Symmetry: C2
Subunit: 322 residues, 2 copies
């Protein structure tokens, strides 16, 4: 039989554009099938063929040669891997386009993608299904906010990512300004109760609707410091795998992740992020297209779960076709 052909799309117009491009190099090298690359420049225009690869020589591609509907053959590929993050990546827009093209693609479908990107709607569905989430309330522009809890809380646009337009309100006197800021990115915002101390845990899921979970990982912040020999050392995000979790908590994180995954009907993959506070777990968010770089959590979690990077990529493609 002939080789199966995959089309990798990377870059994107969201602020996570550089993270995406960074993943491409790794996906191209390890995907177990011949793979072509197409890049979406920060300005929305696409780069195909030669220009796309050259684009991988930089941290970002503000270029763009082809206006949206790119002159791409599409018929030459069995599956499309839209490795794009946030707005115009994980929100169902690209998925919708690919559906109209009749092309099988990696990851969540239109409904699941759009839902998971809306902080309000996703939480409503999860709460309805019995999954714990942090107390929240949605607020729309023009509408009087009615936060049913303490002043320490986050305010953020409902359908965005990368922490853009987000504010941590200390006093109601600031709530007004915070919403006005958020509304600059989405007419709908959400106000979530800020927890403290709290720990962040992340788990990966692989499969169509009924998936398998990876071990649990923890995201820990390392403050900058003055080292005895090297002197100044910058702050850094530390990914702990496996997470130092007590007997039973790991199992509960995994069950909640898989349950939420099944309810929302997610396909292919998802990195589910949680908050752990006072021995209590809270589903924070589901990411249908998690970062895929070597340092990235999702691939490292499954590596610890016994699934090699190339194996992970191969399974994602196979799931797209089933």
């Amino acid at each position: 039989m002939e080789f199966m052909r995959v089309l990798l799309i990377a870059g994107g117009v969201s602020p996570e554009h550089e993270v995406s491009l960074l993943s491409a190099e790794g996906v191209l090298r390890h995907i177990p099938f011949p793979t072509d690359l197409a890049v979406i420049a920060q300005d929305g225009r696409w780069l195909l063929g030669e220009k796309a690869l050259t684009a991988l020589e930089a941290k970002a591609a503000p270029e763009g040669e082809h206006p949206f509907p790119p002159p791409l053959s599409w018929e030459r590929y069995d599956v499309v891997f839209p490795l794009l993050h946030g707005r115009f990546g994980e929100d169902g827009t690209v998925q919708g386009f690919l559906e109209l093209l009749g092309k099988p693609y990696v990851g969540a479908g239109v409904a699941a993608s759009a839902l998971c990107m809306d902080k309000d709607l996703s939480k409503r569905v999860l709460a309805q299904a019995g999954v714990p989430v942090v107390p929240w309330v949605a607020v729309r522009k023009g509408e009087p906010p009615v936060v049913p809890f303490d002043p320490p809380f986050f305010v953020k646009p409902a359908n965005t990512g990368s922490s853009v337009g987000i504010s941590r309100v200390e006093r109601f006197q600031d709530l007004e300004a915070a919403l006005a800021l958020a509304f600059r990115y989405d007419e709908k915002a959400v106000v979530e109760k800020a927890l403290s101390p709290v720990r962040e845990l992340e788990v990966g899921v692989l499969g169509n609707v009924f998936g398998e979970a990876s071990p649990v990982g923890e995201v820990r912040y390392e403050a900058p410091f003055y080292d005895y020999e090297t002197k100044y050392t910058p702050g850094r995000a530390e990914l702990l795998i496996p997470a130092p979790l007590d007997p039973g908590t790991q199992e509960t994180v995994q069950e909640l992740a898989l349950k939420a995954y099944k309810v929302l009907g997610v396909r292919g993959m998802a990195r589910v992020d949680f908050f752990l506070a006072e021995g209590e777990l809270y589903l924070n968010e589901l990411n249908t297209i998690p970062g895929f770089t070597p340092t990235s959590m999702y691939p490292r979690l499954f590596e610890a779960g016994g699934v090699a990077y190339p194996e992970l990529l191969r399974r994602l493609v196979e799931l797209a076709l089933t």
Copy 2:
């Protein structure tokens, strides 16, 4: 100033293709702005310019000349009215495409469109918000059904329309076959408790998120009969406007419709259908792109609400831009 230019897209690949095409003639004649037409043939291919208009000469267009991404200028229009129903019409796919094109369009966005087309997810959100819906349960292929109620119930694929793949189960012995049928159209199905007697009411909403409601209408079936003078007379669907509703029930139907509309963040319009049984109301479904023909309920409801057909069309375009 120059005339504003609108692009009407009609037809579609869903079984409601003929209903859509039928609307086009009426929209083209009454939309208060110069409007161009593009038709999506039943085979998925598009018809532009001259061929599109000629297509309006028949009840259906199985033709199609241009493969999906049609050679349409897009830049020549201020707003796009995708008057397509069901699958590849109201499910967020076309909406996603238009978003990537940066084109303002009539009706619900991607999230709301996909949600409203999923019978399971939409009900979960509505139940979460306190809106009454008929008891239901979602069942996925391979999963053991666990219906928490009586045997008389409907079984249907979760994300389809036009009543395709639907079955009315009389006895559990038939449940098996029913799901197998539904799964032929969607890996996820829903089992809803069938009510009886029950009446069907429909209300229209117009606006972005916070809308205004039209008067309430009732859908009544007229059985075929032998007339004294004309003899045989076929069965027919009777649209009663206003619906003969007791004092207070009309007001409750309207409140629930507007509340559901606001929660789901629907934009532009929606025809909300309800079930009335034992003095109890149940939100049946929200249709983001309701039929738009002269006999159609949505336009007639707003006509009764004082909004002329041309006025309705004009407002839909204005909302797309705000």
